[PDB]
C-alpha cells in the first residue's frame, strides 16, 4: 500500500511514552541489588523496559531480540532543571520575549512585513528576533513600531547564568541572589512565532523522558562482572537525595549538563586476485569455499523442485548442495553438523524456499578502491573455478586496477533476484566496453596480447598448416565457439606452401561479419607499413596492430568496428578468440629481454661522449659569460636565472640527440623496441634512459635548487651552477650512475611518491562531495531535466539531444561509409553519372525520415545537415567520375542506390538510438566525468612545462576553485585581447598605454624622476601626478586635498603646513608609493604577450586584478573577445550565460592536459546546474542560495557538527532531506521511472 514516503526524526510521544510506564524510582539501588542475586529486577531495567536482554515481555512488540522495537515508559525524576539550550538562547538574544510583558511583536505596522512573513517559506522567521535582539526591553512600552521596552531587562553572559536586572541599561548591575529573573516567567510568557512546531514551553527539563533501551547494550558476562551501558539519560535516578528539592537554577542546570547534552555490508567476501583468460569475457570465477557462504532465498518454484532436491541432499561438506534452508513454517532447518536430515518429502517440506550454492550466475559483484568509474563494480557471470583467486578475462583489468602485488580484493553476494536480472542485462554487456565519461573502451588487450598479436601480424611470420594448432584455442575452442573454421586458403603455393601471419589472426567461422579500420601508430608514405591497417570484411589486408588498433584506442578497434556493426555479442566474442589465440602464440616464440637488449654498441657510444663534451662546453661558455656577458642574455627578461632556460634546453638537445641514438641501431629483432613500437609496455623515452642519457631530472619543472648556500650539494663548489651542481644525470641506467646522480634521482623520484600521495588529498574530498551534491538529476521523458521540485534544468541535450553513449566514428558520417563498403551489392555501374541518381536517393531520403517523428527534436535539427553531407558526397563523386574517368569503370566507383539507402537507414538507426531522454540518468555520469579525471592523470601533463615560463599556470586543482568559487583564489587572472591583429610595436603602443627622487627639508616636499623614464615606460604626466596626489593625499588616513601642489615643471608636492605636526611620516609614505602607476587602481602587475600564435601575432593582457570592467578603456580592445577566469566576478560584471560559458571552459582547461577530453555535454550539464536562477551561484562545497536546487547539499558542511544540535534546540529543521539520505533511510527512489501512478 504505502511504505515511507516522507519521514524525519522521532521523539517522545508523551501518551505512548507513559502508558508503558512501570517504575520511575523503585529504591536507591537497581540491577536486583538487594536480593543478593539477580532473578530479574527492578521492573525498569527489566520487563523490559526496552528489550536489552535475551527475553522478557516485550511491550507493544515481540519477540526478542529484534522486532522488539524500543519500548517506552515513564521513568520521570522531576529534578528541578531548565532549558540549557534556551538558557543559552536567553543569554544570547537578550530576553527575546521582552519579559515580563510578552506584548505583541509588531504594532500596526506597516502590515507589509506581516504579509511578507505570512507569504514566504520557512527558515526565515529569525529576522523578527534579530530586529528585537537589542531593542527588546529597551524601548517605549505600549508604543508604535513594536511593543517592548518592558521591563528594563537585559540578560548577562555570566556563563550559563541569565541575570536580568531592571537595567538602565548599563547602569543597574548587582552581584548573592538579587536582581534576578526566573525561567518560569519565560514559560508563562509562552503561555518567530509558531507554537505549532516551535514550542520552548514543553521542552522544560522537569518532565524528562528517556529513549528506550535499544540504544544501550549490556554485556552481562554471564559471570556478574561488568554491565556497563551508555550513556544514558536515566542515570539521574541516583540523585534521589537532591530530587526531594537564581544561582540555584544555574547549579541545577550545570548538574544536568553532565548527562543531558553533548548500506554498509551484506553477503560479502575478500581474497587475493590472479586471473585466467580462459574465462569468457562475460564470465568470471570465484573461489570454491565461497559456496560455503550461504543462506540465499532462491525461492522454490514448481519447475525447480526436483533440480533443487538434487542438491538439497548434499548438505554441509559438498559444493553443489544446500544448507540452512528456509522452511515453509518460517522455522529454517540446517543440514550442517546437526543435519542428519534430507528425507525431503518431495514437494512440500521446502515447498516455499530453498538455498543452494554458486552454480551458474547467480551473479556476484567485485569491489575496488578507489572506484574511479561506475565500471569499477560491474555485473558479470560465475561458475566457479577453484584456487581462491579472483579470476576473470584479463582484458578488463583497466577499469578495476586489479593490481597484482597480491593485495586482496572484495567480493559481494546478491541474494535477491528482483533487479538482479535487470542488473545482469544492463551493466553486464553495455557497461564494460563503452563509458560515457570518456567514450573510450575500458576492455582491451592489457599487455602481451598486444605484442603477441602484433608479432602474428608482422610481415615476417610465416606459418604452417601444422600451425592450425594455435588457431584452435580461438575458433575451434572452449565453450560457445565450436563451429568449424573455413581454413583460410593456402596463401602460398611455392616450392613451399605457407600461411601468412595475418589471416591466422583474422580467423572465425561462425556468424560471418564485416569491418574496416585504418591509422595505426606509424608514419605515412608504403613505408614498411605499420599503419592504415585497412581491415576489410573480417580479413586483414595490410597493417600490424598496436594499442591504438587492438586496444583501448578511440575509434579504430575490435569494438567500434565490432560493437557498432555488428552489434553486441560479437565484440565480447572476438576478444575471447584473441585472449586464447595470441598469448598462446608467445609460448611458442618467447620474449626475453637479456642485456644486449639494453646495451648500446661500442660503435655508437661516441655519440654520447662527444655530445657530452660539446654540451658541457657551451654550458660552461654561457656560465662564464653571465659574469661578463658578451652574448648576451637581457633579452630573456629576466636574465639572472635565464641562463637557466638556455642550459635547460641545451641539456634537452643533449638528451634528444642521445635518445635518437638509442633508437637507430637497435636491431629490429629486439625487446623493448618491440614494446614501444606497439604501445604495449613503455615508450621511446624508456629505451633512452636505459641506453644513453637519463638526464635531466628536475624538481618542480626546474632544475634542483640549492639547500646548501648557493650550491645544491656539498660535494661541489660554491655558487657554481652547472649540469652537475644542479641535477643533471648523464649516465644511462646501463652504466648506471654516480652518487651525485642518484641523490638527484630520489628527489625527482620523490615526486611520484608525493604526486601519487597528495593526489588522494583533493580527490578524496571532491569526489565524495560531487557525488553527495549532484544526485537529484533525472532525465524524464520530455527531453528535459527536472529537480527536487521538478524545476527545469535543460530542454534538450544541446539541440541534438544526444549523449556520448553512441559516439561512433565521425557523429556518424565517415565510419558508416566504410560499414557499407564491406557489404557489396554488386549490380550497378556508371552509365548515367549517378550524381543525379544520388539526388534521387536524396529525395527518397527526404521522404524516408520525414516519417521521422516520435520523441523528437533530435533528427530535424540535423536532417538538413545530413542532406548537405550526402550532397557534398555526390559532388565529390561527380568530380571523381568526371576527372578520374576522363575498363573497370574506375572500380565502378562503387556507389549504388542500395548502398546509399542502407547508409541512410544506418544513419537513422544510430541517430535515433543515441537518443537520451527517454531514459536516461544523465546526472551522476557527468558528476563523475568531471570528478575522476582529476584523480587519474597529473604526471606527463603539468610537468612539460619542462622548462619554460609564459602562460602555463594551473591544472587539476583549478577544479576546487571553480566549484567553490572561493575569494581566496591566488590566481584571479583576467585574460583579454588587445588591438590584436598587429605587430609588436603596433600593439605595444596600447600596451604602454595600459599603465622617485629626493624628498627634502626646509619647506619643500619631494620631486620626481619625471625624466624619460616615464616617457619610455608609459604615457603619464607631472600633472597626472599632481592630480593623483590631490586624491585624498593618502590611502585610509585623512591626509588632505590641499588644493593644490606641484607648482613647478617637476613636482614640488608642497608638504602641507605642519597642522598635524605629528608626522612627516604620512607626508613621506603617501607620496612615496605609486598613485597613477597601477593601471587599475586595485590590481597586481599587468602582463604582455608579444607572441606569434595561430600563424599571426597575438597580443593579450593577462591582468591579475578583479574585476572585469577593467577593460572599459583598453582602447584596443578587442572588446568582442574580452574574457575572465573568476566565476563570481564575471557573474556581476558580464552576462549570465557568459559566466556559464566561462565555467564550461574553465573546467575545460583543467582537462586539455595530456589525453583526457571529457564529454562537453557533461560540463554543459554542470554549467546548467550552476545557473538555475541566472544569477550565477555555482555549486559550492558548502551551500547555495538557490531554492530550485537540492537543499541536501546545504547540510553537507563537511561535516555535521554541533550546529545541528543548536538548531534542534531552537526548533529549526534540518536540510539532510535530499536523496543521499535515502540509502541510509532505505526507501525506493521516485523520479523519472520510480514514480508509478496508474
Amino acid at each position: 500500500a504505502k511504505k515511507i514516503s516522507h519521514i524525519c526524526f522521532g521523539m517522545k510521544s508523551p501518551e505512548e511514552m507513559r502508558q508503558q510506564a512501570h517504575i520511575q524510582v523503585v529504591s536507591k539501588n537497581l540491577y536486583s541489588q538487594d536480593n543478593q542475586h539477580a532473578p530479574l529486577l527492578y521492573g525498569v531495567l527489566d520487563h523490559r523496559m526496552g528489550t536489552s536482554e535475551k527475553d522478557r515481555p516485550c511491550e507493544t512488540c515481540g519477540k526478542n531480540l529484534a522486532d522488539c522495537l524500543g519500548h517506552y515508559g515513564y521513568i520521570d525524576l522531576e529534578l528541578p532543571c531548565f532549558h540549557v539550550g534556551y538558557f543559552r538562547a536567553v543569554i544570547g538574544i537578550l530576553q527575546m520575549i521582552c519579559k515580563t510583558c510578552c506584548h505583541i511583536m509588531l504594532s500596526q505596522e506597516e502590515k507589509k512585513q506581516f504579509l511578507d512573513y505570512l507569504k514566504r517559506p520557512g527558515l526565515t522567521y529569525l529576522q523578527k528576533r534579530g530586529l528585537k535582539k537589542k531593542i527588546s526591553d529597551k524601548c517605549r512600552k505600549k508604543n508604535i513600531c513594536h511593543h517592548c521596552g518592558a521591563f528594563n531587562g537585559t540578560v548577562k553572559k555570566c556563563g550559563l547564568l541569565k541575570i536580568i536586572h531592571e537595567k538602565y541599561k548599563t547602569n543597574k548591575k548587582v552581584v548573592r541572589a538579587q536582581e534576578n529573573l526566573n525561567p518560569l516567567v519565560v514559560l508563562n510568557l509562552f503561555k518567530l512565532m509558531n507554537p505549532e512546531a516551535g514550542k520552548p514551553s514543553d521542552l522544560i527539563l522537569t518532565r524528562l523522558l528517556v529513549p528506550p533501551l535499544c540504544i544501550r547494550p549490556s554485556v552481562v558476562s554471564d559471570l556478574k562482572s561488568g554491565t556497563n551501558e551508555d550513556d544514558l539519560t536515566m542515570k539521574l535516578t541516583e540523585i534521589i537525595f537532591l530530587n526531594d528539592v537564581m544561582e540555584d537554577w544555574d547549579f541545577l542546570q550545570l548538574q544536568c549538563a553532565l548527562y543531558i547534552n553533548s548500506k554498509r555490508v551484506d553477503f560479502s567476501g575478500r581474497t587475493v586476485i590472479s586471473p585466467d583468460p580462459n574465462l569468457r569475457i562475460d564470465e568470471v570465477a570465484v573461489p570454491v569455499h565461497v559456496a560455503k557462504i550461504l543462506t540465499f532465498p532462491e525461492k522454490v518454484n514448481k519447475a525447480n523442485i526436483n533440480f533443487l532436491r538434487k542438491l538439497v541432499q548434499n548438505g554441509p561438506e559438498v559444493h553443489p548442495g544446500a544448507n540452512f534452508i528456509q522452511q515453509r513454517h518460517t522455522q529454517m532447518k540446517r543440514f550442517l553438523k546437526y543435519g542428519n536430515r534430507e528425507k525431503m518429502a518431495q514437494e512440500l517440506k521446502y515447498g516455499d524456499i530453498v538455498e543452494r550454492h554458486l552454480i551458474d550466475g547467480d551473479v556476484v559483484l567485485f569491489n575496488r578502491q578507489p572506484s574511479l568509474h561506475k565500471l569499477s563494480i560491474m555485473a558479470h557471470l560465475a561458475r566457479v573455478k577453484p584456487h581462491r583467486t579472483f579470476r576473470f578475462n584479463e582484458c578488463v583489468c583497466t577499469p578495476y586496477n586489479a593490481d597484482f602485488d597480491g593485495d586482496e580484493m572484495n567480493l559481494h553476494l546478491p541474494q535477491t533476484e528482483e533487479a538482479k536480472a535487470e542488473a545482469l542485462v544492463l551493466m553486464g554487456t553495455k557497461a564494460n566496453l563503452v563509458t560515457p565519461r570518456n567514450g573510450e573502451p575500458l576492455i582491451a588487450a592489457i599487455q602481451d596480447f598486444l605484442t603477441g598479436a602484433y608479432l602474428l601480424t608482422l610481415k615476417d611470420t610465416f606459418f604452417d598448416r601444422a600451425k592450425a594448432c594455435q588457431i584452435i584455442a580461438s575458433i575451434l575452442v572452449g565453450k560457445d565457439e565450436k563451429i568449424k573454421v573455413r581454413l583460410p586458403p593456402p596463401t602460398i603455393l611455392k616450392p613451399v606452401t605457407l600461411w601468412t601471419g595475418k589471416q591466422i589472426f583474422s580467423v572465425i567461422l561462425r556468424p560471418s561479419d564485416d569491418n574496416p579500420v585504418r591509422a595505426n601508430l606509424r608514419t605515412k608514405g608504403l613505408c614498411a607499413n605499420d599503419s592504415y591497417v585497412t581491415i576489410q570484411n573480417s580479413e586483414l589486408m595490410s597493417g600490424s596492430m598496436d594499442k591504438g588498433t587492438l586496444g583501448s584506442g578511440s575509434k579504430n578497434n575490435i569494438f567500434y568496428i565490432l560493437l557498432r556493426d555488428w552489434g553486441q555479442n560479437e565484440a565480447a566474442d572476438a576478444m575471447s578468440r584473441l585472449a586464447r589465440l595470441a598469448p598462446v602464440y608467445l609460448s611458442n616464440r618467447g620474449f626475453s629481454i637479456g642485456i644486449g637488449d639494453v646495451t648500446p654498441g661500442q660503435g655508437l657510444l661516441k655519440a654520447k661522449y662527444e655530445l657530452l663534451n660539446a654540451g658541457y662546453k657551451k654550458c660552461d661558455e654561457y656560465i662564464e659569460a653571465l659574469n661578463t656577458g658578451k652574448l648576451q642574455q637581457q633579452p630573456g627578461c629576466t636574465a639572472e636565472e635565464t641562463l637557466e632556460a638556455l642550459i635547460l634546453k641545451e641539456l634537452s638537445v643533449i638528451r634528444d640527440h642521445a635518445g635518437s641514438a638509442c633508437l637507430r641501431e637497435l636491431d629490429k629483432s629486439n625487446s623493448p623496441l618491440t614494446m614501444a613500437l606497439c604501445g604495449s609496455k613503455g615508450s621511446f623515452i624508456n629505451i633512452s634512459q636505459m641506453i644513453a642519457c637519463v638526464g635531466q631530472q628536475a624538481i618542480s619543472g626546474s632544475r634542483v635548487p640549492d639547500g646548501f648556500e648557493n650550491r645544491s650539494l656539498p660535494h661541489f663548489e660554491k655558487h657554481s651552477k652547472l649540469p652537475a651542481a644542479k641535477g643533471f644525470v648523464a649516465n644511462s641506467f646501463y652504466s648506471g650512475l654516480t652518487p651525485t646522480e642518484f641523490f638527484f634521482h630520489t628527489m625527482a623520484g620523490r615526486e611520484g611518491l608525493v604526486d601519487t600521495a597528495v593526489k588522494t588529498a583533493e580527490t578524496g574530498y571532491m569526489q565524495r562531495r560531487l557525488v553527495k551534491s549532484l544526485e537529484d538529476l533525472c532525465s524524464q521523458y520530455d527531453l528535459t531535466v527536472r529537480s527536487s521540485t521538478g524545476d527545469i534544468i535543460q530542454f534538450i541535450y544541446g539541440g541534438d539531444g544526444l549523449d556520448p553513449a553512441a559516439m561512433e566514428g565521425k557523429l556518424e558520417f565517415k565510419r558508416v561509409l566504410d560499414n557499407i563498403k564491406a557489404v557489396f551489392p554488386c549490380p550497378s555501374e556508371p552509365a548515367l553519372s549517378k550524381n543525379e541518381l544520388i539526388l534521387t536517393t536524396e529525395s527518397i531520403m527526404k521522404k524516408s525520415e520525414f516519417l521521422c517523428c516520435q520523441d523528437s527534436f533530435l533528427q530535424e535539427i540535423k536532417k538538413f545537415i545530413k542532406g548537405v553531407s550526402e550532397k557534398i558526397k555526390k559532388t565529390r563523386d561527380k568530380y571523381g567520375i568526371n576527372d578520374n574517368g576522363t575498363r573497370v569503370l574506375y572500380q565502378l566507383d562503387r556507389i549504388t542506390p542500395t548502398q546509399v539507402e542502407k547508409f541512410l537507414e544506418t544513419c537513422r538507426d544510430k541517430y535515433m538510438r543515441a537518443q537520451m531522454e527517454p531514459g536516461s540518468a544523465v546526472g551522476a555520469l557527468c558528476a563523475q566525468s568531471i570528478g575522476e579525471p582529476g584523480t587519474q592523470m597529473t604526471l606527463k601533463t603539468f610537468h612539460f612545462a619542462g622548462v619554460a615560463s609564459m602562460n602555463i599556470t594551473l591544472g587539476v586543482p583549478r577544479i576546487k576553485e571553480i566549484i567553490n568559487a572561493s575569494k581566496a583564489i591566488s590566481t584571479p587572472i583576467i585574460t583579454a585581447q588587445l588591438d590584436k591583429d598587429d605587430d609588436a610595436d603596433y600593439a605595444r603602443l596600447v600596451k604602454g598605454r595600459i599603465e622617485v627622487f629626493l624628498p627634502d627639508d626646509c619647506f619643500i616636499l619631494v620631486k620626481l624622476s619625471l625624466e624619460r623614464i616615464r616617457l619610455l615606460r608609459l604615457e603619464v604626466n607631472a600633472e597626472t601626478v599632481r592630480y593623483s596626489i590631490c586624491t585624498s593625499k593618502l590611502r585610509v588616513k585623512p591626509g588632505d586635498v590641499a588644493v593644490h601642489g606641484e607648482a613647478v615643471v617637476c613636482v614640488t608636492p608642497r608638504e602641507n603646513s605642519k597642522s598635524s605636526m605629528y608626522y612627516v611620516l604620512q607626508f613621506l609614505k603617501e607620496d612615496l608609493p605609486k598613485v597613477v602607476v597601477q593601471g587599475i587602481p586595485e590590481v597586481s602587475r599587468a602582463v604582455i604577450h608579444i607572441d606569434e600564435q595561430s600563424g599571426k601575432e597575438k597580443y593579450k593582457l593577462l591582468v591579475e586584478g578583479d574585476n572585469l570592467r577593467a577593460v572599459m578603456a583598453t582602447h584596443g580592445v578587442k572588446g568582442t573577445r574580452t574574457t575572465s577566469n573568476n566565476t563570481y566576478e564575471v557573474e556581476k560584471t558580464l552576462g549570465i550565460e557568459a559566466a556559464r560559458t566561462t565555467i564550461i571552459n574553465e573546467i575545460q582547461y583543467t582537462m586539455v592536459n595530456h589525453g583526457m577530453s571529457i564529454d562537453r555535454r557533461h560540463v554543459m550539464l554542470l554549467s546548467d546546474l550552476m545557473t538555475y536562477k541566472g544569477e550565477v551561484l555555482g555549486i559550492t562545497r558548502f551551500g547555495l542560495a538557490k531554492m530550485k536546487e537540492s537543499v541536501l547539499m546545504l547540510a553537507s558542511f563537511e561535516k555535521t557538527a554541533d550546529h545541528l544540535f543548536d538548531a534542534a534546540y531552537f526548533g529549526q529543521k534540518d536540510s539532510v532531506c535530499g536523496v543521499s539520505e535515502c540509502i541510509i533511510m532505505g526507501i525506493p527512489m521516485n523520479i523519472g521511472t520510480g514514480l508509478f501512478k496508474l
Binding site: 533476484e417 542488473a423 544492463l426 552489434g567 520530455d782 521538478g790 535515433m912
Partner: protein
Amino acid sequence: ANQKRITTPYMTKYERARVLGTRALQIAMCAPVMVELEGETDPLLIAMKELKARKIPIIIRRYLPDGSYEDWGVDELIITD
C-alpha cells in the same frame, strides 16, 4: 490515456531490464508461464528463462511529474536493439 507521442519507437533500456526483472519475479513465484511453459528446462537459473520472452504481454506506463500517464503496451513498440 492517449498521451503516447513523446517516446522514441523504443522503450528505454532501464525500463526494459526492470520489466524483465518483474517478469522474473512473476515466473518465480508460481506461474504466469508463457508461450513455452518450461520448454527451456534448466536448474536454478531463474532469470535466464523469461529473458527469452520476445512477446511479453504486459503493460507499463511512463510519466513526468508535470505530465500525464504516457502509457505503453510492450507489444506495440520495438525492443532493446
